[PDB]
Amino acid sequence: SCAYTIDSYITLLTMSSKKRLLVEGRHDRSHLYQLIYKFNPASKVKIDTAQDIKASDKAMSKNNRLKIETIHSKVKGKDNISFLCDRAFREFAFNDQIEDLLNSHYCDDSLYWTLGHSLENYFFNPSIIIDAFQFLSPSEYKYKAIELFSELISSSFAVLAAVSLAAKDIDKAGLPAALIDWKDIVINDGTIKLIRRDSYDIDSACVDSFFNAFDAVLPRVIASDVGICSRVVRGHTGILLLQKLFSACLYYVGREDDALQADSSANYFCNLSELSLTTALAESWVRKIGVLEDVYFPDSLLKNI
């Protein structure tokens, strides 16, 4: 491919005089560009992505974080570059309750971490999710679906965190993406219960291990603080889980008027592209910064560049 190596990129850092930021993926680049352009629409910061940097090592080829750590280690002390990684489950304690050992943005010589699991954890404020889903909706029963969703979102985060922890315990990270479907979700009086459907394309062993982990982790997540709980949800997992939860609540509250119309709208929402959801969440997240004190962002990172 046509991309820089680690050494070539380090040389580019020596040659270029711009203020630079290095992130993991291209989606992180688009979201951070919106974040930077809100404070300074004429800002000249150039954001590079570690996804577009070739690595000679086979193991380091698809480990974006290791690429960032390697680059940061070899130019440790430069002034024009900042680094951002995903915290993942680092600095979290699972001693029967979710505990955050930092509760702030990590900083180590222009290397910064997202406050949550990844960059997408900044979108998990309820106001942002509400505004974004209302704006990006089939526009059939939006007001009642949003009102129900706003009721469910407080307790649903415990479910999402339990799903993510159950996925990482059995190391099947991509399993909840294809296992759980929005139809499996049931909307109760503020709660949800992902019934173990008897029929699944995946083998029963993985499904059984996932539900055993989910059941064994759910009371621990319940006892944890909601604010800490909303940050440990995996970034890619959470987006789809919210998409399904909204498809389920929309069909649940709109089927009585017209079951077919509600099902079509619910499937339409479920068939929406992930990129569309991330862009809508990013726009809502940008708009809510500075309006609500409960919306977070890497302030130290923005200050540094």
Partner 1 sequence: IRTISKIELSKIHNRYNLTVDFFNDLNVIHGKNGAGKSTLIHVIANIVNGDFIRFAFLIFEEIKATYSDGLKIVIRRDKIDEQSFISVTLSNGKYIKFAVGEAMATVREIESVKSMLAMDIDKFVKENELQKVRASYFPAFRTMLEAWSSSSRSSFYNRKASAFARELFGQFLPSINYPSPMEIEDRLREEIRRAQLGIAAYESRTFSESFVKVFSALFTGELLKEIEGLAIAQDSSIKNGYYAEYSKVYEEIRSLINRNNSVSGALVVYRDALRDRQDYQEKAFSEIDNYMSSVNSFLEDKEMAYDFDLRRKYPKVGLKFPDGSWSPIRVLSSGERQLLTMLYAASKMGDDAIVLIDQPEISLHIDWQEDLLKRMLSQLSGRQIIVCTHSPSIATGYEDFMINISPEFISS
Nearer to partner 1, 12 or 186 (CB): 12
Per DSSP, 198 falls in state: S
229-258: which residues touch partner 1 (CB under 8 A)?
none
Q: Is 103 near partner 1 (CB under 8 A)?
A: no
Q: Is 12 near partner 1 (CB under 8 A)?
A: yes
State which of residues 26, 62, 193, 197 lies at the interface with partner 1 (CB under 8 A). Answer: 26
State which of residues 39, 46, 90, 102 lies at the interface with partner 1 (CB under 8 A). Answer: 46
Angle among Cα 14, 110, 27 to the nearest 5 degrees reads: 90
Nearer to partner 1, 10 or 206 (CB): 10
State which of residues 23, 27, 29, 251 lies at the interface with partner 1 (CB under 8 A). Answer: 29
Q: Give the interface segment with partner 1, choosing from 6-14, 60-68, 94-102, 151-159 (CB under 8 A).
A: 6-14
Q: Is 14 near partner 1 (CB under 8 A)?
A: yes
Sign of CA pseudo-dihedral 267, 272, 273, 275: negative
CB of 269 to partner 1, least distance (A): 25
Q: Is 274 near partner 1 (CB under 8 A)?
A: no
**Rounded-to-integer distance, Cα 18 and Cα 238, Å:** 35
Residue whose tokens read 């609500």: 292
Residue 21's DSSP bridge partners are 47, 82
Half-sphere exposure of 26 (CA within 13 A, CB side): 4
Task: With H, G, I as helix, E, B as strand and everything else as coil, classify residue 279.
Answer: helix
Identity at 158, one-letter amino acid code: A
CB of 37 to partner 1, least distance (A): 13
Per DSSP, 96 falls in state: S
Sign of CA pseudo-dihedral 224, 244, 297, 150: negative
Which chain residues interact with partner 1 by CB under 8 A? Answer: 1-5, 7-12, 14-18, 26, 29, 46, 48, 52
